[PDB]
Paper text:
The five-subunit Rpd3S complex (Rpd3, Sin3 (residues 214–1536), Ume1, Rco1, and Eaf3) was reconstituted using a baculovirus/insect-cell expression system. To visualize the structural architecture of Rpd3S, cryo-EM structure determination was performed using the purified Rpd3S complex to generate a three-dimensional (3D) map of 3.5 Å. No density can accommodate the predicted WD40 domain structure of the Ume1 subunit in this high-resolution map. At the center of the Rpd3S structure is Rco1A (residues 258–561), which contains the PHD-SID domain (plant homeobox domain and Sin3-interacting domain) (residues 260–374) and the conserved acidic patch-interacting motif (AIM) (residues 377–397). The C terminus of Rco1A consists of a long helix, which interacts with the equivalent helical segment of Rco1B. The density of the N-terminal chromodomains (CHDs) of the two Eaf3 is not visible, suggesting that their CHDs are likely mobile in the absence of the nucleosome substrate.
In Saccharomyces cerevisiae, cryptic transcription at the coding region is prevented by the activity of Sin3 histone deacetylase (HDAC) complex Rpd3S, which is carried by the transcribing RNA polymerase II (RNAPII) to deacetylate and stabilize chromatin. The five-subunit Rpd3S complex contains a unique subunit Rco1, three core subunits (Rpd3, Sin3, and Ume1) that are shared between the 12-subunit Rpd3L complex, and an Eaf3 subunit that is also a component of the NuA4 histone acetyltransferase (HAT). The overall structure of Rpd3S reveals that the Sin3, Rco1A, and Eaf3A subunits form a large continuous scaffold to hold the Rpd3 deacetylase in position.
Numbering used by the authors:
A (entry chain A): 1 to 384, 405 to 426
B (entry chain D): 220 to 401
C (entry chain B): 661 to 727, 750 to 1031, 1135 to 1324
D (entry chain E): 33 to 66, 258 to 478, 488 to 524, 536 to 577
E (entry chain F): 222 to 373
F (entry chain G): 261 to 294, 298 to 358, 540 to 579
Write the structure that this text describes.
C-alpha cells in the first residue's frame, strides 16, 4: 500500500516446493546475426545455454528441442500478409519488397538477415511447445530463453522484434488456463504484448519499465484498459537507475496484491537483460541479485509459470542472470565462481558469476513510487491451422556442451 | 482574385489541417455528408424558398459547374499526402467493382470547403473576364454563408476513440508506413 | 455558515497568490457554471488548485455537495479490423483486439526518442563485445557447418560408389536448419559464387563436399588462431575500462565537487532549506527553530584521521610559510579540542558559536570530509570481509587470465584493514607518489565504485586548510574565534550572555553578512547550524 | 598493455572486424569434372521517387493523378502530367490556337467553370496546402518543415543538444549537479517553489537523495515537483508540458457526448472582439477573458462567482425536488 | 421584442381620459413608484424567486428607478401632463428641492415607460440576449401587476 | 410651425442649430421659456462630444463602468439626452476602496435572502409531508 523502503533481503530458495523445469533450447538460435553495430544479437542465448551446460544443471531438469513454428501458427495473432512477407524477405531482394518493408516496418530499426524467418519460427515454436507442455502438466516451469519478443505487433516489426511469441504462448495457455498474468521486468516496455490484450479481462499485463520519452513511449498510470480490459493492463513507470532494494520494494507488494486480487492460473515472465547494469540500451541499475530475486519471489508461490528471455545487449550480464535464474528455478543456488566453458575468455576480469551494480544516481524518490503504487492499487480494486495445441517436441537429451578439457 | 470566408469555416479548415497533418486522421469513406447531396440540398433550399427571376438558372449553372469541378479536382491539388493512400485504395476498389469513380458521391463537405478555399488561386491561374470572377466569387460567398447557416449539421467535432461516426477515423501504422516515408 | 461563503473567493485568491493562476481558476469555475464541465472534473481541478489547504478544500467539497484511457492507443475504425489472419479461431478473435493500437511514433509526437547517455568507456566495452560476438558467431557457424559436412562426407565415404554418384539432397542437408551453411559458404566465398557453390553442393555432393570441408577446416583453423591471438588484446583492453565503465559518477566527480563546494553553493543550500518553511504553507510549531537538524558527528577517530591528513598536507604544501604552517596546525588542533570534548588524544599514526560566513564554510568543509570518511568507515568491515575472501577462480588463474599490473604496485587491499589502507593511500596521494587515476582505479577495485566521494579528498583537504587560513588572516574572524574561546567556560550560563554575545559578534560584522549559529550540545556529539539572515539585527 | 596495431592476424583479416579478403579467396576447383532532383514535386518530401526525363520534376508513387503501385510500374518512358501535354495533346499537335477558348463549345451551362475545367488537367498533381489567406488569421498555428500543423508544441527542437558530456544535458541521471541550477531561477536568483508542497526540496551536496525533481510549466512558469504530479521525467520533446493548473481546451460530458473545441485566437486585425453585456448568467459557452463571428465575451470576477453560486443553489433545489418526488412516491406506496 | 397585452386597456383609457380630466387630480401621487417597487421586492423575491442570486432583480429595480429619474419630461407625459410637469417644476423651484419623479408619480406613469421600452431598446446597439432578459423581467413585473389592479 | 414634442402645429420655437419648431411652454428641456441662444437636445449632444474631441473615444465604455449596481442598460441611460424628447404616444400594437465593500455587502444580503428562501421552502415541503402523513 505504501513504499516501505525495506532493504534488499537475500535470495531465499524456500525449497518446500520442487518444480519440474523444462528448458527449451535449439542449437541453431545462436547462428543468426543482425549485423555489426546492432544491439540485438541472438548469440547471447548460446552462452546462456553454455553456462547452464557447465553447472551440472542438466541433472536437475529436462532439456528440450522444440519443433519450430509453422506459418499456420504464427498467423494465430499476426496477419497473413505479414507472415507471408516475413517468410520471403532476404537481404538480397529488398528492392522487390520496398512497399512491404515500410508497410510492416522492416527497415533499419529491424533489419533483414539470413535466417530471420528461421529465427522467428524457432522462437515461436519454443514458446508454443513450452506453453503446451505447461498446459498438459508435463512440466511445472517452462524456460524459453531461446527467443522471446514483446515489441512485435500484429503486423508491425519494432523494438528489434519481429514475431511476438509471447502472445502465441499466452494463446496456447488460454485454451486451458482461464486467467493468465504477464509480468514484464525490463525497460523498453512490452507495448506489443500489452496492446494485444488491452481489451480483454482473462489476460492482463504488468510491466515494470522506464518512462520519460524512452524508446517505447507506452506505459502510464492512465494506460489502464478499455472495453472489457478496464483495470486489466498495469504499468509501473520508473525513473533512471532503480537499484536492487528499490526494485524489490516496488515489485513484491504490487505482485502480492495482484495475485491476491486477480489470482492468475498462469504466469508469463519476461526476464531480460534490458533492465540490467550498463548495456547498449537501458538506464536501470538493477543488478543480477535483484533481477534473480524478483523471479525467486515469483517462484515462491508455486504457480505454473512461464519464464521467457527477452532483450539483452551485453551478453555476459544477461547470460549470467539467465544462468542464475535457471539455477534458482531448479531449487538450488550457484557458486559465484564461473566454470570453464567455451566462452571462458568472454566474461569480465573477475570471471565471477556476478553483475556489478553501476554506482550511478537513483532518482526514484519514495513519494513518487508511493503515489504510483497508490494509483495502481486504486486501479487494482476493480480486479477482484493443422497442428495447433501441439505438445510434440524432440527430447534432444543426447546433445551436450560441457567442457572437460584444459 | 479575392474571397471572403466565414471565420468558423476557416477554423474548421484549420482543424482539418491539424487532424490530417498532426493528429494523423483521415475522413470516412462511407460519407453521409457528401458533396452531391450537400449541393443538391443547398440548391433545393435556396430554390424552394424564393421565386425564379432567372437567377436560379445561374445558380444551377454554378452547382453543376461545382459538381463537374469536384469530379476531377479532387486528385490534383486537394488530398493531403497522408490521405492519398485511402484515395488509391478506393480507386482500386472501384476499378475492381467495374465502376468509374465519382468523388462527389463519396467525399464529404470538408473537401468541398478545401476546394472553395483553394478556388481563388485557380481563378487567378486562368485568364478570365473580371465580371465573371466577381459573379463566381459572389456565388461562392453566398454558398459559404449558407454553409455557415448549417455549420453544425455538416461539421461536428467528435472523437473517433469514443464514437464510430465522427467524419474522421484513425490511421493504422501500415497506413502511416505506406502513405508517409514512401 | 455565517460570513464564510462570501469570503471563500477572497480566501482562494489570497491562497493562490498569483493573478494569472487566479484568472485560470475563475475561467475553470465559469466553464463549470456554463453547463460544460461536470462536478467531478471541477472538484479534481480545485484539488489540483487548493491541494495542501485541507480545511478550505474540505469546506469547498462540503459546499458543492460532492462525495477512460491514457495518452496512447487511439481506436481504429471497424473497416480496418477485417484483416484475415487464417489462424484465428473464435477464442483468438474474442481475446485479441484489432481496434485499439498504439505505436512509438505516435507517443513521441513524431519527434524521436532520447537514448540514455553512456560514457566512452562503455562505448569501448560495446565495441569489444561487438568484435567478440562477431568472431564467436563466425566461429560457431563455421563449426556447425563443419560438423554437418563431416557427417555428410562420412556417410558418403562409408558406402559404395553408385549412390555416391547420385545423392540428390533437399535444402537443409537433412537437418532442421535451412541457411546457416548457406551463410558460411557466402562468407567464405564471393557473393555470386556462394550461390553456385551451394547449388552444386545440393545437387551434386560427394564430388565437392570433402573439398569444401577441407577449405572450411583451414578457414576455421585460421579463425581460431586469430581469435586466440586477438583475445589477449580484448582481455587487456577491458581490464582497464570495466571499472571506469561501471563508475558513472566517478569520472564526473572531479568537476562536480569543484562546482558544488564553493561558498555560494552552501549559502544557496542553507538558504533554500531556510526558506523551505517560509511559504504558502501554514506555520506550525514554531517553524524554523533549527535550520536543518542534520549535522551530527557520530564517529570520533575520524577527528584524529582528518587531523593527520591535514598535518600531512601542511607538511607537503609549499604555499604557506613554516611558522604559518605551525600556527595553522595549532589552530586546527585547538579548534577541534575546543568545539568538542576531545582533550587531544594521541594522533601518531548546549553551546553556541556565532560566526561569520568564513567559519561556516570552513566547518562545512570539515563536516563533508568527516561525512565521506564516516561513510567509508560504515562499510569497513563488510568490504574488508569481501576483499579478504575474494577467491580467484582456479581456471582463470591457470590460464593467466587474471588481471595484471592493476594492484601489483602495492595498491592491493587484501590482508589489511580497508579503512586504514585507504587512509594510507590518501596520505600517499597527499604527499604525491600515487597517480590520481591509479588511486581511483584502486578505490574502484576495492570498494566497488562506492567510494567516488574520496576521489578529491586531497582537494577538499586543500580547501579545508585554505579556509582555515582565512580564519587567521583577518582581524574580524580572529576576534570572532577569540570571543568563541571566551564563550566556552566549561559551563552553561545561557539566556543572559547570548544576547550580548550576538551584539558583540554584530559589532565585528557588516550590516548585510549572513550570520551562522553553530550550536553544539554537551552530549550525543550533535552540532547543528542556524542560518540567520540578520533577522536578529534590530538596527 | 594493449597495443592492437600489430598482431593483425591477416590469416582471417588484417582488419579488426571482417575485411572481405575471404571473399577474394577463390578455391573453386571442387567440382573437378566429376538531371532529376531529390524531392517530390507534389510533396516537397524525401523518399522513393518516380522520375521523368523530359522535366526535372519528380513525384512520389502515390501522389499522381493515376496513382500507381510501385510493384507494377508503367513501362515505356513514363512522362509527368505536365509532360503529358508538351510532347502530347494541346502543345505539340493541334497547336497554333488557344485550346482553352476552343473548350467552351464542348460543354454548356458551365460557362463560369469552363476554363477552370480546361486548366484542371493542364497542371501536375500537388498535395493540398492551406493558402496564405486562411491560416495567418490564427497567430498560434504554424507551418512545419514538412507542411505539418504546429500550434503550441515544443518549439525549436534540439539538434545539437543530443550530444554532451557524461553529465546528462536533458535529465538528472547524475548527482546533485543540476539541482541548484534547476531549483533556482536565473531571473531573480530565488528558489523555485512547488505549488503542491510549498518548498524547494533542493537537498544537499552531501545528501543528494533528499532532493526532488522540479521543472516549471511551459506557459505560466509554475514550478512543480515531479513527485507532486503524475509525471516520470522531463517533457522536452514533442509538445510543451502543461501543469494541471490550466483550463482544459476540450472536455467531454456523459450521462452521446460533446467536445467544445475551445475558441482559438483570431489575430486578423484583432477580429476576435470583446463585449461587456449583462452579468449574472450569459451562456457564453466558455471563451471568456478576465478584466478587473468568433465572439470572446467580457466577464469579470463577481459575475463568475454569482454564476457559480446560482449553479450550486439550483443543483441543491433540483436535488430537493427529487427528494420531494421520492417521498411522494413513498407516501403513495402506503 | 413584443410585450404581452392583458392590462393595457387601462393605458388606452388614460389616453382617452387625459384630454378630459388628466386621470390624476393629485399632483403628488398617493401610491408612488418607491413603495410600489418596494412591495414588489418584498412580494416576489421570497415567493417565486429561486434561491441563488437575487442581485439581477434588485439591479432591475434600481435601474428602473434610475431610468425613471432620467425619464423626466422625456416620453412620459401628454400635453396636459406636460402642463402638470411644468407646474411641478415651478413649485419645486421656490424650495430649491431636486424634483425626483419616483415620489410624485403613480402606476399610470409606469405603463407608458414599459410600453415604449421595446421601441427604444431596439433603437440602440443592444445584444439580443440582454433584450430577452429585459423583456422577461418586464413581463414578470407586468404579470405581478396583473393581480394588483388596485394600484393600477 | 409644428411641434414634434406636441403632436400639433401650435406656436413656434427657434433653435440656433437646425431650427425645428416647438412650443415655448413645451420645450424639450424643462427650463424657463423666457431667453438667450438655445440648442436642441440632439444638437446639444452633437456639440458636446461629436464635433472635435471625445468622438473616437466612446464615453459609453466609461459610463457602464461608473454606475455600480445599475447595469440593466448603460445605453438607454446614456442616450436619454442624446435626442430631443417628445410627447408620449400610444403605440399601435395596443389598440475605489468602497465599491468592493458595497458589492460584498450586497452579495452577503443576496446569500442571506437565498438562505431564508431555502429554509421556507424546506419547511413548507416538510409540513406538506407531515400533514400528508397524518391522513
Amino acid at each position: 500500500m505504501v513504499y516501505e523502503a525495506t532493504p534488499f533481503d537475500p535470495i531465499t530458495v524456500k525449497p518446500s516446493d520442487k518444480r519440474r523445469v523444462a528448458y527449451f533450447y535449439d542449437a541453431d538460435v545462436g547462428n543468426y546475426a543482425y549485423g555489426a553495430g546492432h544491439p540485438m544479437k541472438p548469440h547471447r542465448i548460446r552462452m546462456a545455454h553454455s553456462l547452464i551446460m557447465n553447472y551440472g544443471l542438466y541433472k536437475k531438469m529436462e532439456i528440450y528441442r522444440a519443433k519450430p513454428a509453422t506459418k499456420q501458427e504464427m498467423c494465430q495473432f499476426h496477419t497473413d500478409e505479414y507472415i507471408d512477407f516475413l517468410s520471403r524477405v532476404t537481404p538480397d531482394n529488398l528492392e522487390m519488397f520496398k512497399r512491404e518493408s515500410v508497410k510492416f516496418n522492416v527497415g533499419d530499426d529491424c533489419p533483414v538477415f539470413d535466417g530471420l524467418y528461421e529465427y522467428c519460427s524457432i522462437s515461436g515454436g519454443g514458446s508454443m511447445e513450452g506453453a503446451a507442455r505447461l498446459n498438459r502438466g508435463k512440466c511445472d516451469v517452462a524456460v524459453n530463453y531461446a527467443g522471446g519478443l514483446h515489441h512485435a505487433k500484429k503486423s508491425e516489426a519494432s523494438g528489434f522484434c519481429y514475431l511476438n511469441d509471447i502472445v502465441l504462448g499466452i494463446i496456447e495457455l488460454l485454451r486451458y488456463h482461464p486467467r493468465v498474468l504477464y509480468i514484464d521486468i525490463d525497460v523498453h516496455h512490452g507495448d506489443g504484448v500489452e496492446e494485444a490484450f488491452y481489451t480483454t479481462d482473462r489476460v492482463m499485463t504488468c510491466s515494470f519499465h522506464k518512462y520519460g520519452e524512452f524508446f517505447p513511449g507506452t506505459g502510464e498510470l492512465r494506460d489502464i484498459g478499455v472495453g472489457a480490459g478496464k483495470n486489466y493492463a498495469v504499468n509501473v513507470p520508473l525513473r533512471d537507475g532503480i537499484d536492487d532494494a528499490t526494485y524489490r520494494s516496488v515489485f513484491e507488494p504490487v505482485i502480492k496484491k495482484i495475485m491476491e486480487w486477480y489470482q492468475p492460473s498462469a504466469v508469463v515472465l519476461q526476464c531480460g537483460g534490458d533492465s540490467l547494469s550498463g548495456d547498449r540500451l537501458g538506464c536501470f541499475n538493477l543488478s543480477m541479485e535483484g533481477h534473480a530475486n524478483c523471479v525467486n519471489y515469483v517462484k515462491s508461490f508455486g504457480i505454473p509459470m512461464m519464464v521467457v528471455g527477452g532483450g539483452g545487449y551485453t551478453m555476459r550480464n544477461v547470460a549470467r542472470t539467465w544462468c542464475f535464474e535457471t539455477g534458482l528455478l531448479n531449487n538450488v543456488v550457484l557458486d559465484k565462481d564461473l566454470p570453464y566453458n567455451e566462452y571462458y575468455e568472454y566474461y569480465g576480469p573477475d570471471y565471477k558469476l556476478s553483475v556489478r551494480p553501476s554506482n550511478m544516481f537513483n532518482v526514484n524518490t519514495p513519494e513518487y513510487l508511493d503515489k504510483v503504487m497508490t494509483n495502481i492499487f486504486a486501479n487494482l480494486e476493480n480486479t477482484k491451422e493443422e497442428d495447433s495445441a501441439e505438445a510434440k517436441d524432440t527430447k534432444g537429451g543426447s546433445q551436450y556442451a560441457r567442457d572437460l578439457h584444459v | 482574385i479575392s474571397l471572403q470566408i466565414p471565420i468558423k469555416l476557416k477554423s474548421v479548415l484549420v482543424d482539418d489541417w491539424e487532424y490530417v497533418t498532426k493528429d494523423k486522421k483521415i475522413c470516412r469513406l462511407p460519407a453521409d455528408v457528401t458533396v452531391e447531396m450537400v449541393l443538391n440540398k443547398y440548391e433545393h433550399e435556396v430554390s424552394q424558398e424564393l421565386e425564379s427571376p432567372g437567377s436560379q438558372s445561374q445558380l444551377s449553372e454554378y452547382c453543376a459547374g461545382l459538381k463537374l469541378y469536384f469530379d476531377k479536382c479532387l486528385g490534383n491539388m486537394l488530398l493531403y499526402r497522408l490521405e492519398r493512400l485511402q484515395y488509391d485504395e478506393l480507386l482500386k476498389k472501384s476499378s475492381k467493382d467495374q465502376k468509374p469513380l465519382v468523388p462527389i458521391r463519396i467525399y464529404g463537405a470538408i473537401h468541398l470547403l478545401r476546394l472553395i478555399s483553394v478556388l481563388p488561386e485557380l481563378i487567378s491561374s486562368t485568364t478570365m473576364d473580371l465580371q465573371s470572377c466577381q459573379l463566381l466569387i459572389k456565388q461562392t460567398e453566398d454558398f459559404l454563408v449558407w454553409l455557415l447557416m448549417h455549420v453544425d449539421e455538416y461539421f461536428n467535432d467528435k472523437d473517433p476513440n469514443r464514437s464510430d461516426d465522427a467524419l474522421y477515423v484513425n490511421t493504422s501504422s501500415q497506413y502511416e508506413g505506406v502513405a508517409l516515408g514512401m | 455558515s455565517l460570513n464564510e461563503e462570501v469570503t471563500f473567493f477572497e480566501k482562494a485568491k489570497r491562497y493562490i497568490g498569483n493573478k494569472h493562476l487566479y484568472t485560470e481558476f475563475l475561467k475553470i469555475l465559469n466553464l463549470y457554471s456554463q453547463d460544460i464541465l461536470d462536478l467531478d472534473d471541477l472538484v479534481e481541478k480545485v484539488d489540483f488548485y487548493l491541494g495542501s489547504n485541507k480545511e478550505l478544500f474540505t469546506w469547498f467539497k462540503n459546499f458543492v455537495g460532492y462525495q477512460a484511457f491514457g495518452p496512447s492507443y487511439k481506436r481504429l475504425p471497424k473497416s480496418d479490423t477485417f484483416m484475415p489472419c487464417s489462424g484465428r479461431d473464435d477464442m483468438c478473435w474474442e481475446v485479441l483486439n484489432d481496434e485499439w493500437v498504439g505505436h512509438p511514433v505516435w507517443a513521441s509526437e513524431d519527434s524521436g526518442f532520447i537514448a540514455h547517455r553512456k560514457n566512452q568507456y562503455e562505448e569501448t566495452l560495446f565495441k569489444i563485445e561487438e568484435e567478440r560476438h562477431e568472431y564467436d558467431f563466425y566461429i560457431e557457424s563455421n563449426l556447425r557447418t563443419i560438423q554437418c559436412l563431416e557427417t555428410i562426407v562420412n556417410k558418403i565415404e562409408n558406402m559404395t560408389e553408385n549412390e555416391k554418384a547420385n545423392f540428390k539432397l533437399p535444402p537443409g542437408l537433412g537437418h532442421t536448419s535451412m541457411t546457416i551453411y548457406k551463410k558460411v559458404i557466402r562468407k567464405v566465398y564471393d557473393k555470386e559464387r556462394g550461390f553456385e557453390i551451394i547449388d552444386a553442393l545440393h545437387e551434386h555432393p560427394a564430388v565437392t563436399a570433402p573439398v569444401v570441408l577441407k577449405r572450411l577446416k583451414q578457414k576455421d583453423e585460421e579463425w581460431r588462431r586469430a581469435q586466440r591471438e586477438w583475445n589477449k588484446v580484448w582481455r587487456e583492453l577491458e581490464q582497464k575500462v570495466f571499472f571506469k565503465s561501471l563508475d558513472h559518477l566517478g569520472l564526473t566527480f572531479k568537476q562536480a565537487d569543484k562546482k558544488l563546494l564553493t561558498t555560494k553553493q552552501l549559502i544557496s543550500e542553507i538558504s533554500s532549506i531556510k526558506v523551505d518553511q517560509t511559504n504558502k504553507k501554514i506555520h506550525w510549531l514554531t517553524p524554523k527553530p533549527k535550520s536543518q537538524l542534520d549535522f551530527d558527528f557520530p564517529d570520533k577517530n575520524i577527528f584524529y584521521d582528518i587531523l593527520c591528513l591535514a598535518d600531512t598536507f601542511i607538511t607537503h604544501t609549499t604555499a604557506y610559510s613554516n611558522p604559518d604552517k605551525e600556527r595553522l596546525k595549532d589552530l586546527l588542533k585547538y579548534f577541534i579540542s575546543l568545539f568538542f570534548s576531545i582533550s587531544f588524544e594521541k594522533i601518531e599514526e548546549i553551546f553556541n558559536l556565532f560566526a561569520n560566513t568564513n567559519i561556516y564554510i570552513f566547518f562545512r568543509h570539515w563536516t563533508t570530509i568527516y561525512e565521506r570518511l564516516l561513510e567509508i568507515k560504515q562499510m569497513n568491515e563488510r568490504v574488508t570481509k569481501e576483499i579478504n575472501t575474494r577467491s580467484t577462480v582456479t581456471f582463470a588463474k591457470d590460464l593467466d587470465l587474471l588481471s595484471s599490473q592493476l594492484s601489483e604496485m602495492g595498491l592491493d587491499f587484501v590482508g589489511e584493514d580497508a579503512y586504514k589502507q585507504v587512509l594510507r593511500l590518501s596520505r600517499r596521494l597527499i604527499n604525491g607518489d600515487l597517480e590520481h587515476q591509479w588511486f581511483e582505479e584502486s578505490l574502484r577495485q576495492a570498494y566497488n565504485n562506492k567510494a567516488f566521494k574520496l576521489y578529491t579528498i586531497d582537494k577538499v583537504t586543500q580547501s579545508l586548510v585554505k579556509h582555515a587560513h582565512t580564519l587567521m588572516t583577518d582581524a574580524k574572524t580572529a576576534e570572532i574565534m577569540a570571543l568563541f574561546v571566551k564563550d566556552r567556560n566549561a559551563s552553561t550560563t545561557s539566556a543572559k550572555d547570548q544576547i550580548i554575545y550576538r551584539l558583540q559578534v554584530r559589532s565585528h560584522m557588516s550590516n548585510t553578512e549572513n550570520m551562522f549559529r553553530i550550536e553544539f550540545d554537551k552530549r550525543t556529539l550533535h552540532v547543528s547550524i542556524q542560518y540567520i539572515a540578520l533577522d536578529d539585527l534590530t538596527l | 598493455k594493449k597495443r592492437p596495431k600489430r598482431l593483425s592476424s591477416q590469416n582471417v583479416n588484417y582488419d579488426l572486424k571482417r575485411r572481405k579478403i575471404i571473399t577474394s579467396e577463390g578455391i573453386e576447383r571442387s567440382f573437378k569434372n566429376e538531371e532529376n532532383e531529390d524531392f517530390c514535386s507534389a510533396c516537397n518530401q524525401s523518399g522513393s521517387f518516380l522520375c521523368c526525363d523530359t522535366c526535372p520534376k519528380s513525384f512520389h508513387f502515390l501522389c499522381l493523378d493515376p496513382p500507381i503501385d510501385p510493384n507494377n510500374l508503367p513501362k515505356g518512358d513514363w512522362h509527368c502530367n505536365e509532360c503529358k501535354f508538351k510532347i502530347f495533346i494541346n502543345n505539340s499537335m493541334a497547336t497554333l490556337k488557344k485550346i482553352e477558348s476552343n473548350f467552351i463549345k464542348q460543354n454548356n451551362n458551365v460557362k463560369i467553370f469552363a476554363k477552370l475545367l480546361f486548366n484542371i488537367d493542364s497542371h501536375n498533381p500537388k498535395q493540398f496546402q492551406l493558402p496564405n489567406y486562411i491560416k495567418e488569421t490564427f497567430p498560434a498555428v504554424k507551418t512545419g518543415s514538412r507542411g505539418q500543423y504546429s500550434d503550441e508544441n515544443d518549439k525549436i527542437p534540439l539538434t545539437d543538444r543530443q550530444l554532451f558530456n557524461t553529465s546528462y544535458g536533458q535529465s538528472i541521471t547524475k548527482l546533485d549537479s543540476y539541482n541548484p541550477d534547476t531549483h533556482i531561477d536565473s531571473n531573480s536568483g530565488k528558489f523555485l517553489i512547488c505549488y503542491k508542497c510549498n518548498q524547494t526540496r533542493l537537498g544537499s551536496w552531501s545528501h543528494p537523495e533528499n532532493s526532488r525533481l522540479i521543472m516549471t510549466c511551459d506557459y505560466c512558469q509554475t514550478p512543480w515537483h515531479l513527485d507532486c504530479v503524475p509525471r516520470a521525467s522531463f517533457k522536452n520533446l514533442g509538445s510543451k508540458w502543461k501543469c494541471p493548473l490550466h483550463s482544459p481546451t476540450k472536455v467531454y460530458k456523459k450521462i452521446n457526448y460533446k467536445v467544445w473545441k475551445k475558441q482559438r485566437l483570431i489575430n486578423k486585425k484583432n477580429q476576435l472582439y470583446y463585449e461587456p453585456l449583462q452579468k449574472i448568467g450569459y451562456q457564453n459557452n466558455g471563451n471568456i477573458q478576465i478584466i478587473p463571428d468568433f465572439k470572446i465575451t467580457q466577464i469579470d470576477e463577481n459575475s463568475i462567482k454569482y454564476d457559480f453560486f446560482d449553479k450550486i443553489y439550483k443543483s441543491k433545489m433540483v436535488q430537493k425536488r427529487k427528494l420531494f418526488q421520492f417521498q411522494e412516491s413513498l407516501i403513495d406506496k402506503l
